From a paper:
The Eph receptors are the largest receptor tyrosine kinase family, and together with their cell surface-anchored ephrin ligands represent an important cell-cell communication system that regulates a multitude of physiological and pathological processes. The intracellular portion of the Eph receptors includes a juxtamembrane segment, the tyrosine kinase domain, a linker, a sterile alpha motif (SAM) domain, and a short C-terminal tail containing a PDZ domain-binding motif. The kinase-SAM linker contains a cluster of five serine/threonine residues that besides S897 include S892, T898, S899 and S901.
To determine whether the negative charges introduced by phosphorylation of the linker might affect the kinase-SAM domain arrangement, we solved the structures of two [name] phosphomimetic mutants. In the single molecule of the structure, the SAM domain is completely detached from the kinase domain and the C-terminal part of the linker is fully extended. In the [name]/[name] structure, however, the central portion of the kinase-SAM linker adopts a conformation different from WT and appears to be stabilized by a salt bridge between E897 (replacing S897) and R890. We did not observe any substantial differences in the overall fold of the individual domains between the WT and [name]/[name] structures, and all [name] molecules in both structures adopt the active DFG-in conformation. Supporting this hypothesis, E820 is in a different conformation in the [name] WT structure compared to the [name] [name]/[name] structure. The [name] 5E envelope best fits the more elongated conformation of the [name] [name]/[name] crystal structure, but in general shows less agreement with the crystal structures, suggesting that the [name] intracellular region adopts an ensemble of conformations in solution that is shifted towards more elongated conformations by phosphomimetic negative charges in the linker.
Numbering used by the authors: 591 to 633, 639 to 899, 909 to 965
Write the structure that this text describes.
């Protein structure tokens, strides 16, 4: 429905007002768009993440901050972060969520470089795809799916985590690193979303393919060394991300499927989940690896009578071909081997060469 576009209504309907006394802040664990993030306890008491709103906020800033919880409270899935509640009546504003001990996915994979199996990475991807399938069936377009917005708990369960609003695109074109601000980065956004602001579940599928690449590389940066402008031009001209090291051919095949230029040709999230589950339940399909070239940060785009005789070094037969009536190409491609014998190509090697060449035409 439209319950994803009204933050105040969402806060009213889908959040639980928590009293400040029930919250105990313990230790800073991150720095968010709106303020600091703490690990603490919520009342037996349970560990939780506590997002706070920096003092001196604008009214619209307050609205946008609590709107994330308004969205999050509408969901309920194993692979979507759980909302305990919010503090809105007393300062500072706060959002309470389940604690994810291992934090952001990309940082975690970097810390655990090479410490998992390809099967475990594909299982993480399956969990993320399950969360995104849930979101898509709820008619929710994330617009900002990336490994940094996926959290990981003790049991390596991955959950989608960032449900902000007023999301706008990265405007810095000469940049190569991460830009300042809570913007949607160009490197994870589908082409139509950049060019025409057409964010759909298919653009989320594109970003999910980027997340797949992220995981298979243990948290590398997409389009490394390239600039946002170079990334946009590359994607428009057909370039794509290259094969990760030690990547199953099936997984890179699926990534490339997610990155189809025409959004309609991309797989839906149900298809994604089915493919990943099939692969996991038959892990022998993950041993065939896709070719790896350590030099590339991007894959190249894909491609769309005398001359023919000289292509095979038989130009000296040209006059013969002209004398027997084979003056045009359209009639030669319809030529049989007995016609070749008849015209004067008596040597067997020449017959064989002309025949193999003819097969192509
Ligand atoms: Cs409420």
């Amino acid at each position: 429905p439209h319950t994803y576009e009204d933050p105040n209504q969402a806060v009213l309907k889908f959040t639980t007002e928590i009293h400040p006394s029930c919250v105990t802040r313990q230790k800073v664990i991150g720095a968010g768009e709106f303020g600091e993030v703490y690990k603490g306890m919520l009342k037996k008491e349970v560990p939780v993440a506590i997002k706070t709103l920096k003092a001196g906020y604008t009214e619209k800033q307050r609205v946008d901050f609590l709107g994330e919880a308004g969205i999050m409270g509408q969901f309920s899935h194993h692979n979507i972060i759980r909302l305990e509640g919010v503090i809105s009546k007393y300062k500072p504003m706060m959002i309470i969520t389940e604690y994810m001990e291992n934090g952001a996915l990309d940082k975690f994979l970097r810390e655990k470089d090479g410490e998992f199996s390809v099967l475990q990475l594909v299982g993480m991807l399956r969990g993320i795809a399950a969360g995104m399938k849930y979101l898509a069936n709820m008619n929710y377009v994330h617009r900002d799916l990336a490994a940094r917005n996926i959290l990981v708990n003790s049991n390596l369960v991955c959950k989608v985590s960032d449900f902000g609003l007023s999301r706008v695109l990265e405007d810095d074109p000469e940049a190569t690193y991460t830009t300042s601000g809570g913007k949607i980065p160009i490197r994870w956004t589908a082409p139509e979303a950049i060019s025409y602001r057409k964010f759909t579940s298919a653009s989320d599928v594109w970003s999910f393919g980027i997340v797949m690449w992220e995981v298979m590389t243990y948290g590398e940066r997409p389009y490394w060394e390239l600039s946002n402008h170079e990334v946009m031009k590359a994607i428009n001209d057909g370039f794509r991300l290259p094969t990760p090291m030690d990547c199953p051919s099936a997984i890179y095949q699926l990534m490339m499927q997610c990155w189809q230029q025409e959004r309609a040709r991309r797989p839906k999230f149900a298809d994604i989940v089915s493919i990943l589950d099939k692969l996991i339940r038959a892990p022998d399909s993950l041993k065939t690896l896709a070719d790896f070239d350590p030099r590339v940060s991007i894959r190249l785009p894909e491609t769309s009578v005398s001359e023919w005789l000289e292509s095979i070094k038989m130009q000296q037969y040209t006059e013969h071909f002209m004398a027997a009536g084979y003056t045009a190409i359209e009639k030669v491609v319809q030529m049989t081997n007995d016609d070749i014998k008849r015209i004067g190509v008596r040597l067997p090697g020449h017959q064989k060469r002309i025949a193999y060449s003819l097969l192509g035409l």
